[PDB]
Each structure stands twice: as C-alpha cells, then as structure tokens.
Design an enzyme around this catalytic site. Sequence first.
Site, short mmCIF file in Angstrom:
data_model
loop_
_atom_site.label_atom_id
_atom_site.label_comp_id
_atom_site.label_asym_id
_atom_site.label_seq_id
_atom_site.Cartn_x
_atom_site.Cartn_y
_atom_site.Cartn_z
N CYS A 108 3.12 -9.02 54.83
CA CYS A 108 1.30 -9.19 54.36
C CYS A 108 0.82 -9.62 55.70
O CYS A 108 -0.04 -10.85 55.77
CB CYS A 108 0.93 -8.39 53.45
SG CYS A 108 -1.01 -7.27 53.91
N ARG A 111 -3.28 -10.50 54.73
CA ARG A 111 -3.83 -11.57 52.88
C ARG A 111 -5.50 -12.19 52.86
O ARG A 111 -5.96 -11.88 51.99
CB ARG A 111 -2.75 -12.55 53.05
CG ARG A 111 -1.78 -11.07 52.35
CD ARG A 111 -0.07 -12.31 51.86
NE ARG A 111 0.37 -12.20 53.47
CZ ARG A 111 0.96 -14.16 53.10
NH1 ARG A 111 1.52 -14.16 51.63
NH2 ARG A 111 1.87 -14.12 54.13
N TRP A 280 -6.25 -0.55 55.07
CA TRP A 280 -6.54 0.19 56.35
C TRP A 280 -5.66 -0.65 57.53
O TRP A 280 -4.34 -1.29 57.64
CB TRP A 280 -7.90 -0.35 56.86
CG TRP A 280 -8.67 -1.69 56.61
CD1 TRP A 280 -7.34 -2.76 57.97
CD2 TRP A 280 -8.80 -2.40 55.86
NE1 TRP A 280 -8.72 -4.06 57.64
CE2 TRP A 280 -9.26 -3.80 56.42
CE3 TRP A 280 -9.69 -1.98 54.70
CZ2 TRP A 280 -9.77 -4.96 55.75
CZ3 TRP A 280 -10.14 -3.10 53.82
CH2 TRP A 280 -10.58 -4.77 54.99
N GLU A 285 1.02 -0.36 63.81
CA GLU A 285 1.69 0.12 62.36
C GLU A 285 1.57 1.82 63.24
O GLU A 285 2.96 1.82 63.49
CB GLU A 285 1.38 0.14 61.50
CG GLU A 285 1.00 -1.38 61.02
CD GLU A 285 0.24 -1.21 59.46
OE1 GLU A 285 1.17 -0.89 58.97
OE2 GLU A 285 -1.08 -2.38 59.50
C1 HEM Z 1 -6.92 -4.82 54.25
C2 HEM Z 1 -5.65 -4.28 55.31
C3 HEM Z 1 -4.75 -4.22 54.94
C4 HEM Z 1 -4.05 -4.28 56.85
C5 HEM Z 1 -4.16 -4.90 58.18
C6 HEM Z 1 -2.38 -4.52 56.52
C7 HEM Z 1 -1.19 -5.15 57.10
C8 HEM Z 1 -0.02 -4.78 56.70
C9 HEM Z 1 1.44 -4.83 57.90
C10 HEM Z 1 0.74 -4.34 59.48
C11 HEM Z 1 2.33 -4.82 57.27
C12 HEM Z 1 3.65 -4.67 58.01
C13 HEM Z 1 3.90 -3.50 57.48
C14 HEM Z 1 4.86 -2.71 58.48
O1 HEM Z 1 5.01 -3.65 59.26
O2 HEM Z 1 5.08 -1.16 58.29
C15 HEM Z 1 2.53 -4.84 55.82
C16 HEM Z 1 2.74 -5.39 54.58
C17 HEM Z 1 3.00 -5.41 52.46
N1 HEM Z 1 1.35 -4.92 53.07
FE1 HEM Z 1 -0.34 -5.46 53.47
N2 HEM Z 1 -2.57 -4.96 54.51
C18 HEM Z 1 -3.36 -4.76 54.27
C19 HEM Z 1 -3.70 -4.28 53.34
C20 HEM Z 1 -2.35 -4.49 52.31
C21 HEM Z 1 -3.28 -4.45 50.37
C22 HEM Z 1 -3.84 -3.95 49.67
C23 HEM Z 1 -1.80 -5.09 49.97
C24 HEM Z 1 -1.13 -4.69 48.56
C25 HEM Z 1 -2.45 -4.86 47.73
C26 HEM Z 1 -0.71 -4.51 51.39
C27 HEM Z 1 0.97 -5.66 50.74
C28 HEM Z 1 2.07 -5.46 51.67
C29 HEM Z 1 2.87 -5.45 50.94
C30 HEM Z 1 3.74 -5.52 49.55
C31 HEM Z 1 4.01 -5.43 52.60
C32 HEM Z 1 5.05 -5.46 52.68
C33 HEM Z 1 5.64 -4.34 52.52
C34 HEM Z 1 7.13 -3.94 52.60
O3 HEM Z 1 8.00 -4.79 52.77
O4 HEM Z 1 7.46 -2.64 53.18
N3 HEM Z 1 -1.24 -4.93 52.11
N4 HEM Z 1 0.43 -4.90 55.64
C1 LIG Z 2 14.32 -0.33 53.81
C2 LIG Z 2 13.47 -0.48 53.53
C3 LIG Z 2 12.70 -1.46 52.90
C4 LIG Z 2 11.33 -2.50 52.92
N1 LIG Z 2 10.64 -3.40 52.19
N2 LIG Z 2 9.64 -1.84 53.56
C5 LIG Z 2 10.34 -0.57 54.36
C6 LIG Z 2 9.23 0.63 55.78
C7 LIG Z 2 8.32 -0.22 55.90
C8 LIG Z 2 6.56 1.15 55.96
C9 LIG Z 2 7.13 2.03 56.41
C10 LIG Z 2 5.64 1.99 55.70
C11 LIG Z 2 4.89 2.04 55.98
C12 LIG Z 2 4.60 0.73 55.10
C13 LIG Z 2 3.72 -0.27 55.06
N3 LIG Z 2 3.13 -1.72 54.72
C14 LIG Z 2 1.68 0.16 56.01
C15 LIG Z 2 0.52 -0.74 55.75
C16 LIG Z 2 -0.06 -0.80 54.23
C17 LIG Z 2 -0.91 -1.15 53.84
C18 LIG Z 2 -1.13 -1.69 52.74
C19 LIG Z 2 -1.66 -1.67 54.86
C20 LIG Z 2 -1.17 -1.12 55.99
N4 LIG Z 2 -1.87 -1.89 57.27
N5 LIG Z 2 -0.46 -0.71 55.98
C21 LIG Z 2 5.43 0.09 55.39
C22 LIG Z 2 12.07 -0.19 54.57
#
Ligand code: HEM
Ligand SMILES: Cc1cc(N)nc(CCc2cccc([C@@H](N)Cc3cc(C)cc(N)n3)c2)c1
Lengths: 411, 407
Positions: A108, A111, A280, A285
């Site tokens: 993420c 953070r 947000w 994305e």
């Molecule tokens: C505040 C604004 C936020 C921005 C700009 C942000 C940005 C991002 C981005 C760009 C990714 C990669 C997502 C992707 O490629 O699909 C990501 C992944 C992640 N974010 Fe953040 N995020 C934010 C808030 C949060 C919040 C509030 C949480 C949880 C409380 C969080 C937890 C995660 C987790 C667990 C992933 C990995 C998701 C996965 O493995 O699919 N994010 N975030």
């Molecule tokens: C196989 C597999 C595993 C895995 N761990 N994740 C995927 C899909 C990844 C994915 C797809 C759509 C949205 C988001 C959000 N992480 C998008 C998101 C969420 C939040 C909270 C903020 C932000 N700026 N963006 C993550 C696939």
Amino acid sequence: RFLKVKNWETDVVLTDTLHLKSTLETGCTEHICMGSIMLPVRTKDQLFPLAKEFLDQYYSSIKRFGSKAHMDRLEEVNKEIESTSTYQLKDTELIYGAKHAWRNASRCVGRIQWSKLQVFDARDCTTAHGMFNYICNHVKYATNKGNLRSAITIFPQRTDGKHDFRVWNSQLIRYAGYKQPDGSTLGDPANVQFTEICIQQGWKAPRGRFDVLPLLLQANGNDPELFQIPPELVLEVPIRHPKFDWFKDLGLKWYGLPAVSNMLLEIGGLEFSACPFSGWYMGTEIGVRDYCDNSRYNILEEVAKKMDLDMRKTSSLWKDQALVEINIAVLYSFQSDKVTIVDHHSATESFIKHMENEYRCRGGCPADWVWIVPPMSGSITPVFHQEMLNYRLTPSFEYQPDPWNTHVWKG
Amino acid sequence: RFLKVKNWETDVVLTDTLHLKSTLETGCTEHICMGSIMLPTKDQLFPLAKEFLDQYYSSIKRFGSKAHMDRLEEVNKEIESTSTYQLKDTELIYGAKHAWRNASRCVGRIQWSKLQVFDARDCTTAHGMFNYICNHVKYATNKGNLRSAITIFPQRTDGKHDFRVWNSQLIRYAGYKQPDGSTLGDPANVQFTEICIQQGWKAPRGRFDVLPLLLQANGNDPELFQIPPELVLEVPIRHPKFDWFKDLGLKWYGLPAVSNMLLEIGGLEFSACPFSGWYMGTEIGVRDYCDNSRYNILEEVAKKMDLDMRKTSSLWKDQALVEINIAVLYSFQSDKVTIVDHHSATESFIKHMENEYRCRGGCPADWVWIVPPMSGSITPVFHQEMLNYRLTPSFEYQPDPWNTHVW
Ligand code: HEM
Ligand SMILES: Cc1cc(N)nc(CCc2cccc([C@@H](N)Cc3cc(C)cc(N)n3)c2)c1
Ligand code: HEM
Ligand SMILES: Cc1cc(N)nc(CCc2cccc([C@@H](N)Cc3cc(C)cc(N)n3)c2)c1
Ligand SMILES: C[C@H](O)[C@H](O)[C@H]1CNc2nc(N)[nH]c(=O)c2N1
Ligand SMILES: C[C@H](O)[C@H](O)[C@H]1CNc2nc(N)[nH]c(=O)c2N1
Ligand SMILES: [Zn+2]
C-alpha cells in the site's frame, strides 16, 4: 540484526530492525524469490500466543506494558480462550488493530494516512440486511460529498468457519461485465463472473457499460442476499480532458470511492472475514489499469485513433502517448468535480517521506516494490530508486478465496 | 517444489522445474524478500567442473558417453595436477551463451543463442587487451547493424594476476564536478573520470567526452588507451515533430557494452569479459536522460514544450518523458542504428519465456528489472509472474577494482 536499504538516487541508507518482529512466511527461500508471485478454525493451542503477542504490542503503544491493566487483560483473555475457545477485542484494541493492519500493508503506497482511519464496529450485526445498512453508512460517511475520508467497517469475527460473515463483492462499488455471445465483453471484463452470480441470484441487469453492481452479502454463514446501493450514495465522475474536447464523447466515467471488501483482517489471531475498507484513488489505478489494461476497458486504441497518432508501429510510442493523455483526463476530472484523488508523483513522494519516518520511529517499513512502483512512468517516481524490504507483520490484511468457491449452499 | 507462474492478462499458467537445478543463493529468506535490493581451491572446483561438463555433454546428446567420461577424467587429472583447468573452445562458447541465457535481469535473452564469442585467452598485455576490444567494438557495431558479442580474457589464477577492464561499459561519457557546484556531463562517471585524469588522461572537459579505456592485464597496474574515435558510433538526438529538440545538443552512443562483470563457467572465473548487444530505447530515454542523478533533462524539455509545470498533477513530467523517448527511437532508426522499443522487447521476452518453459522447464527472471522504467503495465511482462533464481554459468557483479588494486 540490522538490514540496510539504499536509495540509488539520493544515496540515503536506512537500517531495518523491525523485520525481527516478523513471524509469517514470505514465499521466498534462499534458493528462489517469489517477489512477483501475486498470491504466494484455529485451536486455543496457537490462539493464546497470538493474543498475547498482539496485547503486548497494544499495551506497548499506549505506554502501559507490564501494568496491572496489561496483566489483568492477558489473564482475562486467557480465561476467555480456555472456556469459550475464542475472545472479544475491546473497542480500543479493535481500532488499534485495524490501523496497524493498514500500517503493515506492504503493497500500500497510501500508508502515510494510516493513523487517520475511521473504524466502524459492526460486531453487533446479525443479518445480511444489517450488513447492507452498515455498508450504506460507510459509503456515505467515506464519500462525504467528494471530500473522501478513509474508513473500515468490521463485521463479526470467524467462529467455527461455518458461520462466516462475507461480502461477496470484491469492491463495494464496481461495474458489471457481461460476456456477449460473439465473445466481446460489455462493461468491465474483470467483473464478468461475479455479475453472472448476481444475475443468477435474481439481479435485473440493465446491461450497459457502467452499471453499478448490487451488493451480495453473507451473514452468519447463511446464503448471501442481494441489495442495490442507493444510487444517490454512489458518487461518479464523468471523464473529460482539459484540452481534448472529444474526450468526453468517449462516454467514460468512474466511481469516486475505492473500497476493498474481499480481504480478511487478522488481529491477535482473530479473523474478520468481512471488513470492507476504503480510501481515495491514485489516478493511475483508473487511468492506467482500469482503462488501459488489455483485459479491462482497453481504451488505448480508440484514444490514440482520436489523437491521430501514428499507430502502424509500436516504436512511435502511441500507446505511451495516449496513456499519458487518459491519465491527465482522470486527474483533471476528479479535481474539477472536487473529488479527492492523488497523482502518482505526489503519492510516491509522500510514501518515501512516510517510509523514512517509519524507519526512524518504528525501526522499519515493510514495502513491496512490485506493487508500490506505479504502472506508468516508473523511474521518474522516487520509489523506483528505493530499495525496500518485504516482510509480514501482524495485524494484517490477507487475501481469502472467493466465497462462491467455498460456500456451503443452504438453498 | 514444482512451481506455477501465471500471466494475469492471458491466464496462461506455466510450470517451472528448472529452479530445482538452482545452485547459488538469492538474498531472500522465508521471513524477508530482498527482491528489490540492487546487490543482495581444488575441493570446490571439481564439483563445479563436473556440474558444468554434465550439462555440456547433456546439451550435445552425449551424456554418459566415453567422450563425456574421458573429459571428466581429463579435467579431473588437470585440477589435481594444476589446481585449475582449461575450457575447450566448444565449452567456452557454450558457457558464455548460457551465462547470458541465465541472466535473470536481461529482457533481451530471446537472442542468447546468437552470440559471437571472441576467445582472448591468449592475451598477455594491456595493449593486447586494447586491440581485442577495438576489434570487438568494430565487429559488434557493424556500421549500425549491431551484432551481439563477448570477448573473454584469461581466467583468474591465484587472484593476484586478474585481467580487468576498469571501465563499467566500453563506451561511456565523462563526468566532472564544477566550481559552480553542479556536474558537467554524466554524473554517474565522476569517480572513474577522476581516476582517468589522475592516471594521466587529458580531459576535453565537455558534456559528452567518450572516456578512455583503463585496461589491467595479468594483475599489473592498469593503462590508458583511447578507442579510435571512428569506431565509436554516436547518434545526434532529434524529434520528428519538435524542431527545437536538436537545439538541446543531445547525443548517445550506439553500442551498449558491459565491461565490469565476472563470467563464471564450470568454476572458472573470467574477471574481464566485456559483452555487448543493442539498446532498448528506455535505457537512454528514461534512465540516462531523465534520472535525477543522471543527465536529468526533464525540466528543460518540459519548458521547451511550454507545459504547465506548476503542479505535478498536470503530468508534465510524464508528457516530456514520452517525447524524449520518441526522439531516441526516431534518431536511432533514422541513422540506421539497431534499437528496440520496450513494447517489442517485452513482447519478444514473453515469447522467449514460453520457449524456455517449453524447452528447458523454466526461465529465471527478475521482474523488478524486466519491467521497463516507463509504461510498465502496458507491456505484457508487467502481468507475467516470474521466478527468480540463480543458475550457472553466470555473469556476476564484482567490486570496482580501484577499491582492490595494490599499485
Ligand atoms: C487513503 C488513500 C489510499 C491510497 C491513495 C491508497 C493507495 C493504494 C494503491 C495504489 C494500491 C495498489 C492497489 C492496486 O494496484 O490495485 C493499494 C493497495 C492496498 N491498500 Fe491502500 N491506499 C489508500 C488507503 C488504504 C486504506 C484505508 C487501507 C485499509 C485500511 C488500505 C490497504 C491496502 C491493502 C491491504 C492493499 C493491497 C490490496 C491487494 O493486495 O489487493 N489502503 N493502496
Ligand atoms: C488475485 C488478486 C490478489 C490480490 N491481493 N488483489 C487482487 C486485485 C487487486 C485490486 C483490485 C481492485 C482494487 C484494489 C484496491 N486495492 C484499490 C484501492 C483500495 C483502497 C482502499 C484505496 C485505493 N487507492 N485503491 C486492488 C487480485
Ligand atoms: C541484444 C540486445 C540486448 C538487449 C535489448 C538487452 C536488454 C537488457 C536490458 C534492458 C537490461 C537492463 C539493464 C539496465 O536496466 O541497466 C539488461 C541487463 C543485462 N543484460 Fe541484456 N540485453 C541485450 C544483450 C545482452 C548480451 C549480449 C548479454 C551477455 C552476453 C547481456 C547480459 C545482461 C546482464 C548480465 C544484465 C544485468 C546487468 C546488471 O545486472 O547490471 N545482455 N539487458
Ligand atoms: C551497483 C550495480 C549493480 C549492477 N548489477 N549493475 C549496475 C549498473 C547497471 C547498468 C548500468 C549501465 C549499463 C548496464 C547494461 N546492462 C546496459 C545494457 C547492456 C547490454 C549488453 C545491452 C543493453 N541493451 N543494455 C547496466 C550497478
Ligand atoms: C505478476 C505481477 O506480480 C502482477 O502483474 C502485479 C505487478 N504489480 C502490481 N502492482 C499494483 N499496484 N497492483 C497490481 O495489481 C500489480 N500486479
Ligand atoms: C531499488 C531498485 O532495485 C533499483 O532502482 C532498480 C529497480 N529496477 C531496475 N531495473 C532495471 N532494468 N535497471 C535498473 O537499474 C533498475 N534499478
Ligand atoms: Zn524474494
């Protein structure tokens, strides 16, 4: 032990000791690195150590480690585990746990925001209807008319694994995808399988390019139920371009609230299988992945046609050129409508500052380079040049298998 | 133990078995991934020789044959007697091609089998080294129609008689710090340029001064030689739409030629083994021109484009980036100097990966290096899972020799 990371642009070197607190495994060994692999019922047995380790961290953070309150709380949890086989988090612990799972999320980039998270405790929820209500309130609170606020809603924890609360949607807000008989897809190709399940469950599909999917909600291990989010709660942004007046006529829009709803939150060995969270967007994305992946809306060709770029050879960089224009359009559009968004320059710069701070105050910041570096303009962002150490801390967010693969249908 | 890699764009799942033959260590453990860290006697030698010759004789369908056993025997005898051994020409060629084949960070490996290997094991002096290198440079350049080549100097003996090319690439531009406080030329090459000046080089003190070679033979002190100017093919950088681009005064050289690595074959160490191919456009346009610690030209280009540089969110950096990269490819193409764009290179590497899985049971790859430094997710490698592991023969990084040289 100490581990050094270097930034190759600035020569700044940092020292990680936090990795010493890592328990969970990475997927890698001394003979293989699995860094680009996307996916690399507990007993009292394992549960009390997990509880104790969590409560030790919690009590350390509040400067009460070793206090009577600390010792009593361990005692209290111990007895609860021995007699009921599980235990309940205090509200303070739940909030702390949810914040830390985000703080620990190595993929993420956002953070820097971890300590500002609105935690909605939905552990008193009992039905899918109850879940729907909670989720509407979350969406409304988080959207805040465009001034987006981070939030998470936490439904009751796993008990025997046969009574799980689950949100079947991968994200609270997503567009349907329909596979056509001719092999083309209408709407978002990523959501085809889930859309079919919704239809199977009785959703009346309007069958357009941007139809907001209904929520499919499982409470207490029961069969999931369909609910349509009130449209007036779903903030959307029509996409236009500051210089290209034909851009609006591509007919593109996106929703403002990114809200993940399929992950599992683990705190002190307890498993919260339904814990939707939102923040947000970073522009890329939507503009890079959602619009330009081949397997998604795939608009590059139509955009570059309209720009009249030379498309007869990849070496003209027409895809790259159109890619930049689409991403300018997304940022411009969200900004013009006053919907919070961050560009990848600003987001990655903030992440570097967050990471340095974390090294100083915490002794480290686990980070996954493969995910942190944006999907366009990689090396002109400061994260590309930053060495990163990836390890797994608890509390954490974990992937879990899609519920339709595991669910025992009651019928 | 048997591992799947998935492409998330195409759903193609390949099975890797080749990693089981991996020998060297990664930097990673079960507790910590170091995927993003840039730099993570007779007894040892016969196992290394056996492992190599086994794969060699297997490759020519003569595993377990008398000729196989006899060579094992011969090499065995030679090590016990001489504490080292000499590769047959055929083994040296095989070994060099495989070191490239096994280079997990190289996107260009579909080409691995077409490598011209120049055997310089008879070289004895730094003048000999210089002659070998000009010949390599001329052969590889081939008037712009580039050909892959490696030149292999004598192997390490006792470690006090190492052959080393001190330069990091055969062709690089000098860097000089100013009284002004800024840097003239390539900031990446400042330290090496100082060593050149301090060894006697008369620097032109310009923005694009081809550095001299600093060649070390047989562990002796290194010597200076200038590559004949007529062998260094360079390209002036213009843009097909922006007339003003040429006024920036940019050029780059045609031949990418790495000269600081260590080739290890069957336990033997070739500490000087300069090798070369042709550029992928982003190497020059993205890294050389736009890295903040390099020529760092984004600001100047964006101004000439009259872009709104007030806020990062106008994406002015990204705009100028694409344009600089269009100019690189156009200039090389116009002057008929081989170049590949990141789209075409990554597409070929996906095809190569498929071949290697089909033909060898795997392909070690480092995703962090393979994914281009711009437009990552619109290239197919972004969506391709990769397993990274170390096979031998291999190219290894080695420390800068000035840190090690006793004069
Ligand atoms: C505040 C604004 C936020 C921005 C700009 C942000 C940005 C991002 C981005 C760009 C990714 C990669 C997502 C992707 O490629 O699909 C990501 C992944 C992640 N974010 Fe953040 N995020 C934010 C808030 C949060 C919040 C509030 C949480 C949880 C409380 C969080 C937890 C995660 C987790 C667990 C992933 C990995 C998701 C996965 O493995 O699919 N994010 N975030
Ligand atoms: C196989 C597999 C595993 C895995 N761990 N994740 C995927 C899909 C990844 C994915 C797809 C759509 C949205 C988001 C959000 N992480 C998008 C998101 C969420 C939040 C909270 C903020 C932000 N700026 N963006 C993550 C696939
Ligand atoms: C045919 C043209 C070639 C292309 C387009 C190509 C492409 C690349 C690219 C883009 C990189 C990343 C380097 C960087 O980002 O700085 C790379 C690294 C590498 N390549 Fe290839 N390559 C080619 C030929 C070769 C040849 C002929 C060899 C050896 C015989 C080779 C061995 C390597 C090694 C060892 C690395 C990693 C270097 C390091 O770790 O510093 N390349 N190559
Ligand atoms: C600390 C450190 C470690 C390490 N392993 N590498 C470096 C420098 C990386 C680098 C720098 C310049 C050129 C190249 C060539 N790898 C560039 C190159 C070479 C060839 C043969 C073809 C091609 N298209 N491009 C690589 C630094
Ligand atoms: C195979 C590879 O790991 C996969 O394509 C990853 C790469 N990096 C990513 N980075 C982010 N932020 N999001 C992603 O979905 C991915 N996908
Ligand atoms: C910190 C990180 O490992 C470093 O910036 C890497 C990232 N990926 C790279 N990829 C390539 N091809 N070349 C590089 O020099 C780098 N640098
Ligand atoms: Zn790893």
